[PDB]
Every structure is written in structure tokens, then in C-alpha cells.
Amino acid sequence: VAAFLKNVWAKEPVLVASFAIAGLAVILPTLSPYTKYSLMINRATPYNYPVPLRDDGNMPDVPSHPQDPQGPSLEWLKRL
Amino acid sequence: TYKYVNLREPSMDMKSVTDRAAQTLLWTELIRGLGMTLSYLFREPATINYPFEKGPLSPRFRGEHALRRYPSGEERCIACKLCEAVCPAQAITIEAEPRADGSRRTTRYDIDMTKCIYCGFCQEACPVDAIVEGPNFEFSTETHEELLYNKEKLLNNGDKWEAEIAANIQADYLYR
Amino acid sequence: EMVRKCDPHIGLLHRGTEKLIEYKTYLQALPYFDRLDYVSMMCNEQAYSLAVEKLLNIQPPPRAQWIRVLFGEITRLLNHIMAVTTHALDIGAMTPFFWMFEEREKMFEFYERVSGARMHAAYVRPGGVHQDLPLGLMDDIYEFSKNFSLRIDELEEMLTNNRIWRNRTVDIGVVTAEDALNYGFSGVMLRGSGIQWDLRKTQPYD
Amino acid sequence: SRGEYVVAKLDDLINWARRSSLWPMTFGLACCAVEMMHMAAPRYDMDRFGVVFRASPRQSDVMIVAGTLTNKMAPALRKVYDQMPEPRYVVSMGSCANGGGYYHYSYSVVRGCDRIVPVDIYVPGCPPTAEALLYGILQLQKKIKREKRLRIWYRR
Amino acid sequence: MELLQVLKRGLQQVSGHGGLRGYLRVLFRANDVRVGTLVGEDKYGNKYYEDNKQFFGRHRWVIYTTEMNGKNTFWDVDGSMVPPEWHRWLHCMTDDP
Amino acid sequence: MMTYIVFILSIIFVMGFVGFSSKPSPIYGGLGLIVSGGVGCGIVLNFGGSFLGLMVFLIYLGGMMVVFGYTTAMATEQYNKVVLGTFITGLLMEFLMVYYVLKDKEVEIVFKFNGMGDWVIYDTGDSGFFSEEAMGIAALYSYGTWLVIVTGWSLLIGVVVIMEITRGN
Amino acid sequence: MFMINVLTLIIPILLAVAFLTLVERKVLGYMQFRKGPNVVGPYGLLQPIADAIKLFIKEPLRPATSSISMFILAPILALTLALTMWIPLPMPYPLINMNLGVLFMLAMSSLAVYSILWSGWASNSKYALIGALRAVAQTISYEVTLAIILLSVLLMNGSFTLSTLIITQEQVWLIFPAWPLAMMWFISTLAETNRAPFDLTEGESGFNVEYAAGPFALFFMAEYANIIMMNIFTTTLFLGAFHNPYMPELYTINFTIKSLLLSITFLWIRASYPRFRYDQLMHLLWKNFLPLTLALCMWHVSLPILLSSIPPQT
Amino acid sequence: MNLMITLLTNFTLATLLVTIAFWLPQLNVYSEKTSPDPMGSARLPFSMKFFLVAITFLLFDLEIALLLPLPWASQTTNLNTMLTMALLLIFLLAVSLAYEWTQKGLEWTE
Amino acid sequence: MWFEVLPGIAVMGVCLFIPGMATARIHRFSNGGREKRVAHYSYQWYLMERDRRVSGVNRYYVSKGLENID
Ligand SMILES: CCCCCCCCCCCCCCCCCC(=O)OC[C@H](COP(=O)([O-])OCC[N+](C)(C)C)OC(=O)CCCCCCCCCCCCCCCCC
Ligand SMILES: CCCCCCCCCCCCCCCCCC(=O)OC[C@H](COP(=O)(O)OCCN)OC(=O)CCCCCCCCCCCCCCCCC
Ligand SMILES: CCCCCCCCCCCCCCCCCC(=O)OC[C@H](COP(=O)(O)OCCN)OC(=O)CCCCCCCCCCCCCCCCC
Ligand SMILES: CCCCCCCCCCCCCCCCCC(=O)OC[C@H](COP(=O)(O)OCCN)OC(=O)CCCCCCCCCCCCCCCCC
Ligand SMILES: CCCCCCCCCCCCCCCCCC(=O)OC[C@H](COP(=O)(O)OCCN)OC(=O)CCCCCCCCCCCCCCCCC
Ligand SMILES: CCCCCCCCCCC1=C(C)C(=O)C(OC)=C(OC)C1=O
Ligand code: SF4
Ligand code: SF4
Ligand code: SF4
């Protein structure tokens, strides 16, 4: 188990490097703490129009202007 | 008394193994060959500028054949036929007869420059230093028949190249 | 991709040297041996001279013997340069051909200075050598041999450790020792299989 | 007149183009091929004259016969000569190709390569030095320079 | 720096051929431009130069004449254009011109 | 006549199909199919499908018709009335169809076709800051999970199958 | 006005090809301890003109071709595909700005093997056909790794647009995060254009043995244009330069210098090593380059996700 | 518009160069040549190795066509699914290569 | 010596500098002293056509600013 790795790394180093890179690529995104940042960067990109909602009377969370305090914030993106 | 080329076992420790694997993955000896060919680019080339510069030669050089003369105008060949006897390619044809004053002189002396192997046996078998192999080598012709020398052509070559043939003989005759 | 049969057809350079030798004297037959192997001139001359001296029951003077061995070794350098560089040129590497052909031209200059001809010297003759060495030749030989170590080192740097070069040679044409002996091989072909044989060590000359 | 001047200048142009880009093929038969290789060495440098090293037989201009032409080799030499595109030139190197040389009276040697192919330049020697073959190549260039093809075409 | 020495040597090569006209003349005739000590000249007009700092082979050279025996040799130079008394010196068979 | 560029390209497409479908020789059929594929990629590009046309050039022509001509070079050793006859009659039906289309601006063979230029069917709006076909293709890894799975399995099985049947044992 | 742009693109390509022939001869000469051509002109500056005129007044071979159609068509395709792979190259502004210029280049490079196939089939020699088939197989087998490497490199770019490739390298060179891809890409482009140590057709019949000297020169000119184009593409991919939008000459001079250095590196490679065997280069590709290319492709897909560094789509 | 103008210009320049390269020595009247491959009239031997490497290239090219939209597809919101599908596709590429490797598929053209 | 390869490399460098400089100068000249506008997506093309329609000269690089509004 231990001498096998040394022998196969002395004999075929290209395959050892390929399998190691593959294992890193397949186990690292599940372990890194920055994948959620990629998720909420991709979902916060404004491709299409933010269509407004008709004010019935009960939406305290929805802002009435872009500069209003309520609403989603991208300060985490500006700092990171 | 003998040595063992290519009988070096490879070491199997981790240092040697990682060195060989890094040499495999990063192509070290290929960079070595590239770099040394680059170093050979920045050297002065060994090319001489022909025809303005000529390669070095020696007084023993064997080029075009010539017939010499004594320092009184009399030609040196006395028709002894040793040069045509020693010629390994049979390139020399000699015919002789006594001339008007009874001297033993050739009436025909042909050398086939397409048969001759330029071996210099004739100039060393001559007892009177009559036939020589001069220093000229740039005598390429456009026709086969221009390479079939008679007596007149060889005498003209001797009269043309005497001022160099005599100096080469003076430089070399103590080694013979 | 795999070769099943090789039939080498030769005879395109059969000049008929032996009959012409039979029609001439020994001194006239010496340049035929000069022109046999046109990269190993003085070695063939030395073999002919040794055979004729053996039949004539004479031996050359010691200085002629030392001159013969020195020019045989220069001839060996010429032959090995030509063989290795042309082998690499046929495989595909072309730089060492020029790199060692410069030194080949220098050795040709040595030949011309001692004999008057660059290739076919006709220098080694039965009984010794035709002419003595001119003054100042051995200093040039010493300088050339002083730099030839670095020349061999640079050829070895270009060729030996290359993976592309060794991939074309590591397991090609493996010969066993008994098959090398039975097929009449000699020299480097015998020595590459491990057979410890050398005519300069086992049956020495001058 | 104007036409003779035009064809003279065009003849000079095409002769300069042909003589300054001579691509040789070499028949590596014998000793003289080793001397050809020594002319292709760094010292003499055949390439610097526009004369490349070992061009293909299907695109070469000058064919060099360096060595002995035996009876078993002569039809192959003629077959190679016939496939060359025009303008083609032949240079004979050394005594074996000039007239037979050492092996002139042999039973299996063609007495000169001019019995098989037309030959333009004869280089004498055994072997002729690299200087001598370079001189022969430059003399061939001089021969190409004084060609008069377009003037002959205009006058006919 | 040491590039200025190389540039200055090139400028003396331009000046040592008697100006740009001679420089271009020797450049297009001999395919070379370096200057050396004039060893001598012969009856036909060939000029023989030497430069002992160059390596063995380039340390002696000849600039051919432009007319030899009634033939225009401005571009048609020949290796057989050297008389024998200078032919012995040029091919390094001797040290004395 | 410049408004009829896609129509002219379609005419060249069907003419090349008539030419290679007459079967003169397998290599000439391959050459005609290559030309027809290039013209069809031109049709797709002029319709707005840059990615699909470049897929046609990269995979159909540069990657697959190479294999077809490569196999054609390993058979059909190198060196008619029927070929010329079908080529002539196919050209005749094609040009008769073109004349009947352009003379009356309507035609019916199996379905009803209209002889106006094909610029009329286009959409008058813009797609914003993206191309629609690229987003549709890019949704393969997010939406088409099942399609990816079945296509990749079929490709691997095809590799296994080709290795199986060419062995001979 | 646009035809002036087309002409000033395509005529300097031919001029650069001829002087590439001269430069390669001279550089190989100076690397082999000798000189290149210096007799025909001042330092050989007139050698390509003389060689071109000689090749264009040479006698044709006049073969017994099986098909004169593809015999004509193969140099047509070779020259057209050599000249058409320059129009989306940013210098720093491409002549034809393409949204998918990289994949357009891949399509043209994949289409380039039909010249080899048709030149092999048109000649009556069967050994010429076998050599053409082997060359085609090597070419497509290296197309595979070209495509995978380009796909994996483009994941740091975000699109197929060639002009964005300058914007990506505004901070650092792309050879820093993708140097194994750079080495494999360089070797794959070296084997793509059939150059040493992969030029098997010169080692022991070419695919164009029966072609005349003129069409042979056209094929060789197309090959050299392919070499220059590939080196410029490699420089754009991995060695991007600083582009001032007010002074485009800075980018033009910078990438010209870098691409000339890369082409001189091509000539440097061609005179250092022996040639490969056919099976040796097939082993080098299918068993060495391909698994590492696949591993690095998976690594460069999964890397920008875990680094929160997805490049912008537009 | 400009693209097909450039394409036509490149095509007509190539065909002009080819026409001049063909028909210019045709105006010469050099000679008439009779001329009466190492193999004389042997049939081309069918090799399974070249066909096998061609088909392997075709199948890998198809999976490359599948892999091509990854730069566009990385911009999706469903990043876990896209990453899993991409890794699965390249893993299937690797598995097909390994199956070709183990069953002596890459043999004598390795 | 080795610096004699430099004339050929210089001619090649000039012939490689020519197309990019010509392209940049032609784009700047033909677009009114500005860069050639990139239209990769239909929104940028719609802005192109709107600017061409608002120019009043049928020419997309003749851009009018605050001098047009009342
Ligand atoms: C564009 C920029 C410049 C590019 C370079 C240009 C200059 C250099 C030119 C070199 C010479 C070129 C001519 C020869 C070309 C042919 C030879 C050749 O290239 O062969 C390739 C050789 C061939 O290998 P091989 O054939 O020697 O392999 C032996 C295989 N057996 C035993 C089966 C025979 O090597 C490769 O293919 C390797 C490619 C590059 C690998 C890069 C790996 C990067 C590091 C990964 C991580 C490693 C650590 C371990 C894991 C850690 C994980 C956290
Ligand atoms: C799980 C990770 C992700 C996996 C999917 C992605 C993979 C990416 C790389 C794809 C590679 C495809 C091709 C693989 C072929 C392997 C089989 C093989 O070639 O076996 C033969 C070889 C011995 O060679 P031979 O039989 O002589 O063949 C002629 C060449 N010399 O045999 C060998 O050389 C031995 C090969 C097997 C052992 C390799 C061990 C490598 C270990 C590296 C460290 C651990 C990495 C983490 C993953 C776990 C690996 C077990
Ligand atoms: C992008 C840039 C690309 C550049 C490409 C070209 C690079 C190299 C440029 C040229 C370099 C120098 C060339 C010099 C050639 C020789 C000139 C000369 O002096 O020729 C003399 C010769 C004989 O003259 P004669 O009258 O007989 O002499 C007796 C007087 N004592 O007379 C003759 O031979 C006749 C006249 C010949 C004149 C030749 C002039 C040079 C031709 C160059 C062609 C290409 C020019 C550039 C094209 C692209 C740019 C526009
Ligand atoms: C209506 C009137 C016009 C009719 C048509 C003619 C058009 C012009 C053709 C070119 C000029 C005609 C004269 C050609 C040369 C004649 C003089 C000559 O032979 O000069 C020799 C001289 C070099 O001397 P050389 O013998 O080589 O000496 C070696 C050194 N010891 O050589 C030199 O110094 C260099 C000679 C250079 C020749 C000119 C440059 C090449 C040709 C350029 C134009 C054609 C090609 C254009 C580009 C095509 C694509 C590559
Ligand atoms: C033996 C026969 C002769 C062989 C030699 C000649 C033919 C082969 C060599 C030339 C090959 C030419 C290939 C042309 C298509 C390449 C793809 C293409 O056009 O891409 C560019 C562009 C798509 O990119 P994109 O940026 O999205 O478009 C602008 C978006 N704002 O797309 C556009 O800009 C689209 C522009 C309008 C549509 C153009 C259509 C061109 C004509 C049809 C194909 C012509 C070639 C036919 C023959 C193929 C080979 C046999
Ligand atoms: C428009 C036409 C331009 C001229 C044609 C391309 C340039 C000439 C290439 C000639 C050439 C040279 C110089 C050359 O050196 C060479 O050897 C490698 C060739 O291949 C055998 C050549 O074809
Ligand atoms: S040099 Fe030799 S072959 Fe020539 S003529 Fe003299 S003896 Fe005869
Ligand atoms: S050996 Fe001398 S003297 Fe005797 S015939 Fe010959 S040239 Fe004359
Ligand atoms: S002429 Fe002399 S050197 Fe040349 S091949 Fe004949 S024997 Fe050898």
C-alpha cells in the first residue's frame, strides 16, 4: 500500500500526477468554503429586468426606491 | 583493461525517484540540449570566404601535374619510363626517340587526368625531378577531352607554375 | 508496421578490386587498400603493410611503428566521428554532424600535412612510412587532442541523455553473444554483447 | 532595338534566379561523397551560396555524381536522371565518374558517367578537395550566367 | 558598457574602406567588409591583405582586380585568378609574401 | 436579389445533394457532401445560429467526414450514363420547382409553401445581453442531466461495441 | 476601404513567409557553427526572391493523376485555410470581430486535413497514399488534445471571444496559472503543423511527391503561414500583452516581438532533437498527453467554482 | 457581409496563385517525357490499426462536442449539478480511454 | 557573426507589425476618430441602430449630446 505508491511514482509518474490532479479536482469543491460565494455571485447577476410589484399595502420588505434600506445587499461582494 | 559502459543501477530511494520523476514531468534534459544549442549559436562560425579566402595547404600537396626544366631552358625528362611503369592506374603513355642533337628525349608524354588517382608515385619515381604534382587544384573543365594532357600542356603547366613548384621542392626535398 | 523479412541487395559498388590487385605489384596495390574503406584509410594501409612485412620476414623501425599507431588512432577518431554523426543524421539529429565535421576537417589537415593528400594518403607502406613527420606537426596534434575532450563532451551532452535519442536505441537490435560469435561479428558488435575481445589487446601489433 | 534590350534584361533576371538557387542532389556512391559531405561542413558552407544540403531528387537542379558508377548501378542512375525537371545539370566528381579512374579496366565499372548522362562540369581529383568541388560549383554558376535562352528565342 | 566598442569598431570598418562608396563596393563584391593590413599587390591588380587577430583561415585574403587579361572581373571573380608567387602565400604554404 | 440569400443558399444545398446523391464514386460523393455541408452551415449562420453552424464545421466536416474519406481511401482502389442522367433530371425538377415558386409566389406539393423572401418570419425584438441559442445549449449541464447521462452512456457503449466487432474473435 | 484592410492583412503574410524561410535558413546555419546565405544579397536578403523565381520557372512534373479535380483543389484549400485563419486574430483589434473566433479557428484547423487527404489520393503512388494516411491520423489525433487544451484554458476567459483574451491577462500572464497546459499546447501545436521532431514525411514518401515545384512551393508557403499563425495564437493565449486603447502600436509591437520569439523557438526546437517514430508519438499522445490533459481539464473546471472566480460571461 | 468578401478575396487569391503556378511553365516548350513507389502494382493492404485510431478519434471528437459548452454553462445558478455533470462527462472520457488502453486497443500505434 | 540574422528578423517584424497598425488606423479613421464599436449582442446592436437613427446623418459614429435637447 505504501511501497506500491513509491513504485508506481517511480515507474509511471504521469499517471500518478493525472490521478492525483483528478482526485484533487473531485474532492476540493466539496471542501472549500468559497463555493457558496460562487453560487450567490452567479445568482446576483442582473441579466433581465427586475419587474416591479403592484403595492397592495402589505410589503414592508420590498423597497419603494433603489436607495431604500430594505432589499438585497451586495456589500459582501464589494468587500469579499 | 576494460570498463563497464552502462552498468549503473538506479537508486531506489525517494530522493532519486523524485529527481527522475521531476526530470520526466518538467523536461530537464530537453532544456539542457536547447540551452547548449543556444550557446553554440553565439559563437563565431568557422566559415571561410571562398574564393577570397583559401583553406590551408602544405608543400607536399598533390594537385595538377607539370613537367619541369633545368635552370638553363633544357627540359629535365630523359625518357626513362619509370613514371609510366610505377603508375598504378596506367595513366601515363610515353614514346621516345633520339632528337636532332642525339639527346634522349620524349616525343610523346600523355597523362590521362581522368585515369590518374593523384597518388604521387610518378614524382617520387623520377630520378631527375622532371614530373611533379604541382600545387594547383582549381582546374575543372567543361569537357572530357580537356582532361587528356599531352606533352605541350604539361610543359605549359610547368612554365606556368615553376615559381611555386621550385619553392615547394626547395621546402620539402630534405624530407626525401 | 512490423518487418518480417529483410533482403539486402548489394553489389552496386563491386569494382572488382581483387582481380586488379592480382594484376599489379604490391606498391601499386597499396592505394586499392587505401580506397577500400574510405573512412579508415590508414588502418587498411597498416593491415596490408603488416601482411606484406609478415611475408617478407622484415620488421619496421620503432619510429615508424609509433607513427603508425598514432595515425591509426587518429583514423579511429575520424571513423567514430563519421559513424556516430551519420547515425544521428539518419535518425534525425543534424547539429553534431557539422560540430564534429569541423574537427574531422582538422584531422584531414593533419593527414595532408604528413602525406599531401587529405583522404587517400598512401602513407603507410610495407617497411614503415613513406616520409618523416614535418617539424611542428605534433604540437598541432597536441592542441587538437587537448580540445577534443570538450568536443566529445558536447556531443555526449546533445545525444546521450536525450529521451528521444535513447527511445530509438534502448531495445533495438539485441544480439546474444553466441549468435554474435556464430554470425562472424567482430569489434563493437562483439563488445556490445559483453564479449571481452580486442585485437589490440589479445593479438597486438607494432 | 527595344525588344532585344527587354529579352536581354529578362535573360539576366532568369539566369540570376537559376544560378543563385542551385539545389543539388548527391549520389553517395564512394569516397567522393565523403568529400562532398566535407564541403557541406561549416568551413566551406555550401548553403551560403544558395546551394542547399541534400535536396530531393524531384526538385533538384544540379545532380552530382560522386563515386564509381558500376554496371549494376547505371540504369538506376539513368532512371534518376530522367525524372529530374528541367533545367537540369550534371557535375562529375572525381576520376571514377570522370573516366573510370583506378578501376578503368575493370569488368564491372562504367568507364565514365558521360556514357550514361550528359555532363556539364568535370571536377578532377581523387578525391578532389572540398575547395575543388566548390570551384566546380561556382564554375557551373558562371556557365549558367552566360546562357542566352531568351535571345536565342527572339532571334529564331 | 561594451556595446559601444562594437558600434565604434563598425564605424571604423565603414571609415577604413574610404567612405560609404568603397564600403558598399567591397560589401557587394567580396561579401565582407573587414579591414586589414595590406600585405601587397601584384601586377594584375589583386590586393592581398592580412589580419593576424582573426582565426586560422580568415587571417589572409585577396580582393581581386576588376580587369584581368582583358576580361571584366567586377562580378566574375575566379579562384584561378591568383598568380603562383602569391598563390603560395595565400594558401598558407609559407609565411613570406 | 440580396434579400434572397438564404433561398439561394438552399438552392445550392439541394443542388449539391442531387450531385452527390447520383453516386458517381464514393470519393466524389464525399466531396459533394462536404460542399453541401458547408453551404448548409452557411444557411444556419445566416439564420442566426453561429454555434450550431460552427458545430457543423467542427464535428460533421472537420471530424467525421474526415473519417468517411479516410475509410474511402483505404478501400475503392483508384483508377457514367446513369450518373449524368439522374443529375440532369434532378437539376430539371429543381429548376422547375424554382420557376413555379417564383412565378406565382405560392406552391403546393405536399405542404403549401410561399414564394416570398424568408426575411419576413424574423422577430422584431432584441435578445438583451445574451444570445438565446448559447443559453439553450448551456442549459445542458443544468437542465439536461438525463440527456447527458444517456448520451454519455451511449458513447461509451459505442466505443466498447466498435472495439468488440473489429477484433474478429 | 475594407478591401484595403484585407490586402494589408494578406500581402504581409506572404512577405513574412518568404522572410521566414530566409530567417530559418540563417538561424539553422548559425546554430550549426556555419553561416546561412550571404552571397545572393546583403546578408542573403535577396535569397527568397531568387528561390521563388526559380521555383516558378521550373518544369512541372506532369503526373498521371487519378483525379485532376482534387489535384487542383488541394493547394486551393491549403492556401485558403492558411489565409483565412488570420481574420479573427486581435492585433489588438481583429479584422473580423467574431463572438466565437476561437471555435472558428478550431473548425478551420480541423478542416485543414483535406489538403493532405486529397493530395495523397490524387497521386497514383500507393506509398504516397500510405504516408498521407499516416499524416492524417497524426494530425487528427493531435486535434483532439488541441481541443481539450483550448477548452480547459478558456474556462479562465469566460467566452470564446479572442478580444476578451487580452482583457483576461490585464493583470498577469496566463502562462502562470496554466503552464502545464502551455507546455502541452506548445508541443501539440508543434506536432499540429507537422514540424520537427514530428515531421515524419521527411524521414524514412511524402503526401505531395507527384506535385509540381510550383504547387509544392504553395503547399510549403501554406505550412509556414500555419506556423506563424499558430505562434501568434499561442502568444495571444498565454503571453498576453499590455494594450493601451489610445496607443494600439504598443500592443502590436509587443505581441509581434513575442510571436517572433516563439517562432524562433520553433526553429530552435527543429535543430536539437532526433525525430520520433510513428508509434512513439502515438504513445506520447494517447498515453502521456491525453490523461494529463483530461486531469487538468477536470481541475480547471472545478477550480474557479471553489475559488469564487467565475469569469464574466460578457 | 465583410466576412464573405474576405473569404472570396482569399479564395480568388489562392486560385490566382495556383493558376499562375500551374500554367506558367505550360508556356515553356521544354520537352516530351516518356517515363516508362517501391511497390510496383501491389494492392493497398487493409490495416485495422489506422481504422481503429480513426474511429477512436471520431468518438472522442463526439464527446468533445458534448464538452464544448462548458464556459457558457459555468454561469448557471445550479452550480452543483453543472459541476457534477461536467465531472461525469470527463470521467466517461477517461473511462473510455482506459478501456481502450487495457484491451490492447492502442497497440503498435500506442 | 550572430547579429547578421537581424536584417531578416527585422523585415519579418516589419511585415508582422504592418497588419495590426493598418487595421487600427483604418478603424480609427473610418469611425470618426474613435474605436470600432463592438456589437456582440443584440442590445448593443439596438443601441448602434438607435444612435444611427438619432444622428440625423445616417451615420452611427456622429454622436450628438446635450446640444440636441431643448
Ligand atoms: C509556450 C510556452 C513554452 C513551452 C515550452 C517550450 C520550450 C521547451 C521545449 C521542450 C522540447 C520540445 C521537443 C520535444 C517534444 C516531445 C517530448 C515531450 O514533450 O514529451 C513529453 C513527456 C512524455 O513523457 P514520457 O514519455 O517521458 O513518459 C514516460 C512514460 N512511459 C514510462 C510509459 C514510457 O512528458 C509529458 O508528457 C509531461 C507533460 C507535462 C506535464 C506537466 C505536469 C505539471 C505538474 C503536475 C503536478 C506534479 C506533482 C504531483 C501531483 C501534485 C498534486 C498536488
Ligand atoms: C479516483 C480519481 C479520479 C478517477 C477518474 C479520472 C482519471 C483521470 C486520468 C485518466 C487516465 C486514463 C487512463 C488510465 C490507464 C490506467 C491503466 C494502465 O495504463 O495500466 C497499465 C499501466 C502499466 O503500464 P503497461 O501495462 O506497461 O502499459 C504500457 C505503458 N507502460 O499501469 C500503471 O501504470 C498503473 C496504473 C494504476 C495505478 C495508478 C495509481 C495512481 C495513484 C495516485 C495517487 C492517488 C490519487 C487519488 C485517486 C485514487 C487512485 C487509486
Ligand atoms: C517590407 C520590406 C521588404 C523588403 C524586401 C527586399 C529586401 C532586400 C532589399 C534590397 C537589398 C539590396 C539589394 C541590392 C542588389 C544589387 C544592386 C546593385 O548594385 O546591382 C548591380 C547590378 C550590376 O550593375 P552594373 O551596372 O552591371 O555594374 C557595373 C558598375 N560598376 O545591377 C543589377 O543587378 C540590376 C539592377 C538590380 C537592382 C536591384 C535592387 C534591389 C531589388 C530589391 C527587390 C525588393 C525591393 C523591396 C520590395 C518591397 C518593398 C517595396
Ligand atoms: C522593360 C525592362 C525590364 C524587363 C524585365 C526585367 C525586370 C528587372 C529584372 C532584374 C534586373 C535585371 C538584371 C538582373 C541581374 C543582372 C546583373 C548581374 O548578374 O548582377 C550580378 C550581381 C551579383 O554578382 P554575382 O555574379 O552574383 O557575384 C557573386 C559575388 N562574387 O547581382 C546583384 O548584385 C543582385 C542582382 C539582383 C537582381 C534584381 C533583384 C531581383 C529581381 C527583382 C524583381 C523581380 C522579382 C520581384 C519579386 C517576386 C516575388 C519574390
Ligand atoms: C472545394 C470547394 C472550395 C474549398 C475552398 C473554399 C471553402 C473552404 C475554406 C473557407 C471556409 C469558410 C468558412 C465560413 C464559415 C465560418 C463560420 C463563420 O462564418 O463564423 C463567423 C460568424 C459567426 O460568429 P459571430 O461572431 O457569432 O457572428 C457575428 C455575430 N454578431 O458568422 C458570420 O459572420 C456569418 C456571416 C453570414 C453567413 C456567411 C456564409 C458564408 C458562405 C457559406 C459557406 C462558404 C463555404 C462553402 C464551402 C465549404 C467547404 C467545401
Ligand atoms: C507569392 C509567392 C511567394 C514566393 C513563394 C514562397 C517563398 C519561396 C519558398 C522557397 C523555398 C525556400 C526559400 C527554401 O529554403 C526551402 O527549403 C527549406 C524550400 O522548400 C524546399 C522552399 O520552397
Ligand atoms: S599520381 Fe599516381 S596515378 Fe597519377 S600519374 Fe602519377 S603515378 Fe599515375
Ligand atoms: S620518371 Fe621522370 S625522367 Fe623518367 S620518363 Fe618519367 S618524367 Fe621522364
Ligand atoms: S575518384 Fe578516387 S576518391 Fe573518388 S570515388 Fe574514385 S577512388 Fe574514391
Swiss-Prot record, chain F:
E.C. no: 7.1.1.2
InterPro entries: ComplexI_Subunit6, NADH_UbQ/plastoQ_OxRdtase_su6, Nuo/plastoQ_OxRdtase_6_NuoJ
Domain of life: Eukaryota
Single GO BP term: mitochondrial respiratory chain complex I assembly
Catalytic activity: a ubiquinone + NADH + 5 H(+)(in) = a ubiquinol + NAD(+) + 4 H(+)(out)
Family annotation (Pfam families): Oxidored_q3
Keywords: Electron transport, Membrane, Mitochondrion, Mitochondrion inner membrane, NAD, Respiratory chain, Translocase, Transmembrane, Transmembrane helix, Transport, Ubiquinone
Membrane spanning residue stretches: 1-21, 25-45, 47-67, 82-102, 143-163
Compartments reported by the entry: Mitochondrion inner membrane
Any one GO cellular component localisation term in the record: mitochondrial inner membrane
Membrane topology: Multi-pass membrane protein
MF terms (GO), sorted A to Z: NADH dehydrogenase (ubiquinone) activity
Task of the protein: Core subunit of the mitochondrial membrane respiratory chain NADH dehydrogenase (Complex I) which catalyzes electron transfer from NADH through the respiratory chain, using ubiquinone as an electron acceptor. Essential for the catalytic activity and assembly of complex I.
Complex formation: Core subunit of respiratory chain NADH dehydrogenase (Complex I) which is composed of 45 different subunits.
Family, per entry: Belongs to the complex I subunit 6 family.
Protein known as: NADH-ubiquinone oxidoreductase chain 6
The organism's taxonomic lineage, starting at the top: Eukaryota, Metazoa, Chordata, Craniata, Vertebrata
Gene responsible for this protein: MT-ND6
From Swiss-Prot, chain G:
Zinc-finger listed as a keyword: no
One Pfam family named in its UniProt record: NADHdh
Assigned keywords, A-Z: Electron transport, Membrane, Mitochondrion, Mitochondrion inner membrane, NAD, Respiratory chain, Translocase, Transmembrane, Transmembrane helix, Transport, Ubiquinone
Membrane topology summary: Multi-pass membrane protein
Reactions catalysed: a ubiquinone + NADH + 5 H(+)(in) = a ubiquinol + NAD(+) + 4 H(+)(out)
Top-rank EC class of the record's enzyme: translocase
One GO BP: mitochondrial respiratory chain complex I assembly
Transmembrane portions of the chain: 2-22, 68-88, 100-120, 147-167, 172-192, 213-233, 249-269, 290-310
Main subcellular location of this protein, as a coarse class: mitochondrion
One GO MF term attached to the UniProt entry: NADH dehydrogenase (ubiquinone) activity
Family recorded in the similarity comment: Belongs to the complex I subunit 1 family.
Role description: Core subunit of the mitochondrial membrane respiratory chain NADH dehydrogenase (Complex I) that is believed to belong to the minimal assembly required for catalysis. Complex I functions in the transfer of electrons from NADH to the respiratory chain. The immediate electron acceptor for the enzyme is believed to be ubiquinone.
Matches recorded under HAMAP family: NDH1_NuoH
Protein name: NADH-ubiquinone oxidoreductase chain 1
Organism: Ovis aries (Sheep)
UniProtKB/Swiss-Prot annotation, chain H:
Protein name (record): NADH-ubiquinone oxidoreductase chain 3
Keyword Mitochondrion in record: yes
A GO BP annotation: mitochondrial electron transport, NADH to ubiquinone
The organism's place on the tree of life at top rank: Eukaryota
MF terms in GO: NADH dehydrogenase (ubiquinone) activity
Signal peptide: none
Function as written in the Swiss-Prot or TrEMBL entry: Core subunit of the mitochondrial membrane respiratory chain NADH dehydrogenase (Complex I) which catalyzes electron transfer from NADH through the respiratory chain, using ubiquinone as an electron acceptor. Essential for the catalytic activity of complex I.
Topology versus the membrane: Multi-pass membrane protein
Catalysed reaction equations from the record: a ubiquinone + NADH + 5 H(+)(in) = a ubiquinol + NAD(+) + 4 H(+)(out)
Subcellular location: Mitochondrion inner membrane
Bilayer-spanning residue ranges: 3-23, 50-70, 79-99
Family: Belongs to the complex I subunit 3 family.
InterPro entries, per database record: NADH_UbQ/plastoQ_OxRdtase_su3, NDAH_ubi_oxred_su3_sf
Keywords: Electron transport, Membrane, Mitochondrion, Mitochondrion inner membrane, NAD, Respiratory chain, Translocase, Transmembrane, Transmembrane helix, Transport, Ubiquinone
Gene from which the chain derives: MT-ND3
The enzyme's E.C. designation: 7.1.1.2
One cellular component (GO) term of this entry: mitochondrial inner membrane
UniProt xrefs under Pfam families: Oxidored_q4
Subunit structure, interactors included: Core subunit of respiratory chain NADH dehydrogenase (Complex I) which is composed of 45 different subunits. Interacts with TMEM186. Interacts with TMEM242.
